[PDB]
Subunit: 972 residues, 2 copies
Amino acid sequence: SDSQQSIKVLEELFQKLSVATADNRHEIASEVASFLNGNIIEHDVPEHFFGELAKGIKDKKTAANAMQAVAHIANQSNLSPSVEPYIVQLVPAICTNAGNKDKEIQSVASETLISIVNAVNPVAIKALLPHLTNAIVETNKWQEKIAILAAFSAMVDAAKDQVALRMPELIPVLSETMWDTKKEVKAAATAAMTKATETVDNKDIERFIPSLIQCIADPTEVPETVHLLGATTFVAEVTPATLSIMVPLLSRGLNERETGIKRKSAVIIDNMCKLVEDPQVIAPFLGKLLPGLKSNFATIADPEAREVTLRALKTLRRVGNVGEDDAIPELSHAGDVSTTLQVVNELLKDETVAPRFKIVVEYIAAIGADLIDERIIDQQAWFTHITPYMTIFLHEKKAKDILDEFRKRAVDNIPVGPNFDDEEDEGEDLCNCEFSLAYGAKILLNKTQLRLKRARRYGICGPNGCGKSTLMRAIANGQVDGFPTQEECRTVYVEHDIDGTHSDTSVLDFVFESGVGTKEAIKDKLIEFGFTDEMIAMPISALSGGWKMKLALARAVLRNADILLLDEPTNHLDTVNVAWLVNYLNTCGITSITISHDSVFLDNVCEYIINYEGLKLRKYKGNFTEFVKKCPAAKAYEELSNTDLEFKFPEPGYLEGVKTKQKAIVKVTNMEFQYPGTSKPQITDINFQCSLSSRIAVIGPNGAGKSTLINVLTGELLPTSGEVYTHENCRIAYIKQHAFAHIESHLDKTPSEYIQWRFQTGEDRETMDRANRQINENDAEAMNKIFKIEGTPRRIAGIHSRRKFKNTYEYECSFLLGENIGMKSERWVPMMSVDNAWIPRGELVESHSKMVAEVDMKEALASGQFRPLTRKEIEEHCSMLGLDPEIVSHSRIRGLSGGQKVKLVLAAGTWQRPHLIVLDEPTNYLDRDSLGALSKALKEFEGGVIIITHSAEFTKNLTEEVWAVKDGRMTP
Amino acid sequence: SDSQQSIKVLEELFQKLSVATADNRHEIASEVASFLNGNIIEHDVPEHFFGELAKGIKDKKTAANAMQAVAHIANQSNLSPSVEPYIVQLVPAICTNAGNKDKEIQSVASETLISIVNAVNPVAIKALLPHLTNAIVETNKWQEKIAILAAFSAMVDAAKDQVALRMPELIPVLSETMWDTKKEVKAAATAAMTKATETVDNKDIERFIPSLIQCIADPTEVPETVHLLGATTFVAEVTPATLSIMVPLLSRGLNERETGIKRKSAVIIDNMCKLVEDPQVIAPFLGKLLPGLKSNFATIADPEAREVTLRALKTLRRVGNVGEDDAIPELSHAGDVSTTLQVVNELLKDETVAPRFKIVVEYIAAIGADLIDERIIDQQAWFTHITPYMTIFLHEKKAKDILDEFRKRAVDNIPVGPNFDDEEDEGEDLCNCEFSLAYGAKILLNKTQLRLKRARRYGICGPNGCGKSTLMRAIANGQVDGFPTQEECRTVYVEHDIDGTHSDTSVLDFVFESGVGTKEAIKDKLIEFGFTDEMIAMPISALSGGWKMKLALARAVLRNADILLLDEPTNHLDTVNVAWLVNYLNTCGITSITISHDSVFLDNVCEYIINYEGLKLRKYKGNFTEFVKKCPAAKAYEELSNTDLEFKFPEPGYLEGVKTKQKAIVKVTNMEFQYPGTSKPQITDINFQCSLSSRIAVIGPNGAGKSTLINVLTGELLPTSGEVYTHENCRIAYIKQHAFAHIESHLDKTPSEYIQWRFQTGEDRETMDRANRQINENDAEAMNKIFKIEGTPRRIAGIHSRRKFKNTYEYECSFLLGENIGMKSERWVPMMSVDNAWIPRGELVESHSKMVAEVDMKEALASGQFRPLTRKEIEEHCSMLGLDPEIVSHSRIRGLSGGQKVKLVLAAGTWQRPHLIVLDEPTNYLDRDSLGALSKALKEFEGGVIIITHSAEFTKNLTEEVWAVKDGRMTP
């Protein structure tokens, strides 16, 4: 019913929008957006509304208003998943208008595409990109292309990782467009191309990108560029993105007349491709290289060049895993939308899914396919991204049950990665033995293989109690069948030696009694490692952690080790020493094998990982994190990364005057809100209080009332009437699902840089200003916005102060008065502070976010509520929320589990140590485990808690005050 | 005497050269090169030799030979400044042959051009760039154009910093070349344009470079391109390079019929130019922007575009510093070649300068011009680069005195400059006053101005003694008549407050006594800061340095400080706590002023530098590094005392079997060297010994005997007959001026990266293999070089072991036997270990350096000689040579004085703890002060010293043994 009320509101608002003028258009669109994006409907969609919007976009008479509405709805921080798939379904239509002859419809369409690209869940890229590529290749309107190219570029920033995986499909499209007859398009397409290549992210060829882009536009540079790339030393991962910009050049190189170039192309092909682990990556590129390689093999007279051609052809066949007759193996379809659409349609066969929800099911399949492509398989991840879309037409319980099955079936389609192959012989082998390892009648390893390459650095991982250290003892003590003898391959089990020295023997004497060398030689090496003449005379008993390690490694150089064996080497080592060790191992030139619960330390040292899988040893190229992608089974090892446990919210910042916890810090009376343009208010006669003891539950079905109330509570809507008392410095943290899903856009950031990113303007860019486009962070001419105060046109001279105004902030602005506007004598004169005015944040944020931010920092400091973004403080705060400092400061969010992301997003939301935590529908995107931890933490929060849920179970022990809107009213 | 001998040696060599067949042209070139680059002639030039060679090149019959030798003379690590100005002189002739119809002459010519580009002192760019620009613009041979274009590209890597300054000139020349009607020339010009844009170093427009370039090839793409850049947000300082790729586009934009573009063009113009700190920068571009703006401002109707165009014009006038009537300021001439040439000619008038040295004087003027453009004004920097040339026709003494006068005069032409423009950066003003500062009746500052911005960070510098601390103490204590009161702007002299608290007073009470809030509030903030309840309760007398600095800052926050005043804050702080302070200051949101001797700390914290200049405070934008670029007369803040000028060489590496510094580690007997093709040997019957206590002075005038003697001692030339004993692991360090001058190509690197670069292969790429044309690196095509072993043609399969062989090494190679060479069945079959052979280093280095390097490493590791390039090792080693660790690991060589570079070059050269230090004419490029510190450092060196010099002054009280060659004969 309150749900059905939302429908009437939309009709009134839409009716208002349909007749909007070019001057009031934005105002009305914003209303539609603030309302439409809330919890206004119960398990359904505003159908008539979306039907009118679509028909409104097509009709030239209403095209600009309808689309402008779509743009506001598609804002960066508030686009609701309940409406998201119905918005993307309008892209084809909007792309069409981007080709319209009318200068205004074309413009508004272009901007709207950019807005949509910036608002959708980055993971639902597979539902959006196709519309854009379909349009750009099918249209004959050059302006429509320039716009679509603009949207591609925007997508690169909004979903860099997601785009990286679509590169093999996007590059061909951009390349063709670069050869468009229209010169403006040629310009736009190159620009979108240089932008697209930003997803490559490969240090080995980075500097050669601007060269590669030119070859696309001018094939005559092929020979010149092929030669430039001959110097490249491929070491980094050869991803689909790297191939999409490397292969087309190479392919043309193979077809050149000159033999030297055919050869040079073959060299690069070999060098690069021998670095492809998954035959899936190179599969779609083989057809562009094999034919040129076989043809060159039967045309090149010179034996040396021919041998190089064949050498490349073999690598390709190996890597690509081709069959007989160069038959390319069938590609996996795990990540195909078509495949996931089938999987979900099967799980919904018994459910009755009405026609208007079909587009939603498609969105779900799209999200699923991408999650599988990025190999995001953990439960919480899937719940975070898909649950809210299913509940559009299903009850939560059933939704989560089907979602988890969907995830399990989709995940099941991921092809098994092929066993690692050793064509990486840069230097000789240290060992290569077949053996078994038995420990007291217990079999640890059975007929496994061990091959270690010289100067390579390895890490040994495995399940607790599998013999990780027994294997090392065995290698150290010459007890591994086949392993070389100390004479051939000298190993030094660092810091694990055993002698009979006393606790009063000097460091020099100690080493000396080992026979390694002369006292002169020893002293020389000890000094080179940092030991002072004094330290060398003191008794070993006085060596601290860092120096025993330096001594150990110094002795190892004296014995002339070939392999350094380290077992938990970072223990008793301060950060400076660990960094010292990471550095030394990475530059000593000797091979090392390491065991260590410190995943970050493994990531900075290791190049390969020897993992225990049953009674077999399996190698994986890459450090620990890389390894984990290839073997998700390892997300259960006892390695710093995998550690996950409950968390706690921070203590709310001290409030002056608040004697007791029942003392109201928020008090609302006779409040009411009525959207301008509607015939009756959405909520009226509202009264409520909040204290640090509040334990409120906002229940009931979604609707005009419930959503609007919440929208006012959270600061999004300024009430139309009523009194609002907020204690000075009172702060609210609004935990929405949006932040959880949108973190996937920052996978290359570290948890620390993310929190810094979310508070770049002093305020939380995820919850503050949800009623504004804000899609104007890259602009400076829109700072000349003409405000209308008292009937006069004024520009902003400056913002000087701030103050609470109801549920938002007002800012003291000094203006410039516009005189003789539109004339050669136009001039803006400064108005003395007599005319300053208190403008609400919402009216400034779009045009003057900068000045507003500067003023916000001034006030935060002034009142002692500013929390500086220092690494230490960020680290300390993330620790409360159960995230380890090393991960927070030196790991990429890309490697965090779904659950860890929940923690990180939660940490960001509570960074300003809020006094009140309002949580919107937090069962609608969290799983059983997550809710358990969120329940315990919300129970111990020394601040006020407001939970808006549909779940009765979740209110258990978390509520003591009920809020329920009925007919636009509510009494606690 | 022995000098005239060199002339004959060259005549015989040149004869064997003019005849040399292609099959053995290289061997003879090498000879000419190795001998020609040595100290072979006393104060003069092999005039007849350069004549034969000159003409020889102009001749088709001997073009390829003459040129090859030149390519060999011009090798990366050994081209001597004694012959440099003469080689550049042959560029025109060489450019001409780059167009010759003969395929071989055309090919060798292109190579020679590259070789020269990478061989000359990068600082002498102005003496070479012209020959190239002229030729490409005057020729009509397309193959010549391509070759010259390849030369431009090579110059970008060889002289990046120097080329960046020449961008406003190179771009127009390449742009013009992009319009050639030969597709290959158009492509090559584009390629060169791409490589050139690599001097931009400005991420702000990185994504637009392929677009700007494409726009130069098709100006019809200007409008759309302008649209594309409108979204650019300039933040990095705009340099000449940036303008050189931005103006042509914007210039043409101003001229588009469409007003939208005229408007957009100005907008970007504005946003990019208000970032030009030096008007001299934008100077030569004003001519392409002012007329467009003025006209547009008097032609455009739309009232919005007018404001924008005018806004742009107003900005341009301020940044450009234009006089009334828009009079473009007189373009400076301090850096013009003609300007510096006039100066040296003036100081040289009273001296006589034969015609054959005019080219030398011109080279000197070109070098001085560049030193000025780069703003390298210190004395040593000038002696490093010019002295060795001045000595081609003047005695060292006359040379230095003239040169020192050349510098001062040349440097006087550098324009003083325009003052601080901060008003335009983000912030309200905390203070903006004029004041005078009197201390004890003494004047510190007279009627100066001081304006500070909120949240902006400042650093204070000035001569040691000017009163920096007094100014700060004055401000802090509120004693600067005109500066805001505490009530208007709260300041906090961090860690400098005076009160009477007890040692017992607890941290809590201490802060509480300042009256900044309740203990509850205070506690809540301290804990947020990072304090523990354990610390808040403990007495303030038990605080460590780091916690004392934190309590200081924490109190400053509770007092709502508006300005933090720091005086030597990094004192008594370890790296970790310093890192914390840096991080805190950068994120606390409060303004801070800092006086610090730590230039790295200032670089990491300051945004502006207020400097003392007389009795005025001058403000500069940017940190300390940037500040120095603007004000070069400041790299001397440490200087004042003669002692901060010293350094020590490392202790030589351990040598088993050497118990006294008398033991010979090098012993040569009956040695002789005679260049194949020469009538008689250059040196014969040579017997000498070297020990860790040697102190030899190789005296006497330059000659065929002396240089050849040195060339054998330093391992460059392999002796023809005689024995050579070298202790195992013995290392010799060769110090020439070449290294000191060429470090100007690595200004981008940090001292640590320069040292890593020099020893990337475990060997000093600067002094190793000076006899070979190593230039080969990306040349995997000449790895098919055929070696005739035992009469059989073969190819290197692999290099496995090393072994001493006279003054150099030999390598054991495995082969590929050539079968049916020249037949369709030709095949290179791998041979067995049995047929492996030993081959001299000089024969492999030019084609298998990578393989040789690998063997060298495994050897360095086997012997325990290898020194890991860890950051701590480098820092410790560079610390012995007077360089600060922070500076070494985080500062760019670009910001070091010529004196600091001298230390770094010595450090790099002694990185392997050599046992003998051979210094080639140290007085010929070092000033009085450097020599002073060097001499003292050589007296303390625990290893053998060999000084080759003309200065008996330098050797006096230093060396005691004499090596005076006399007719190919010498006896200690």
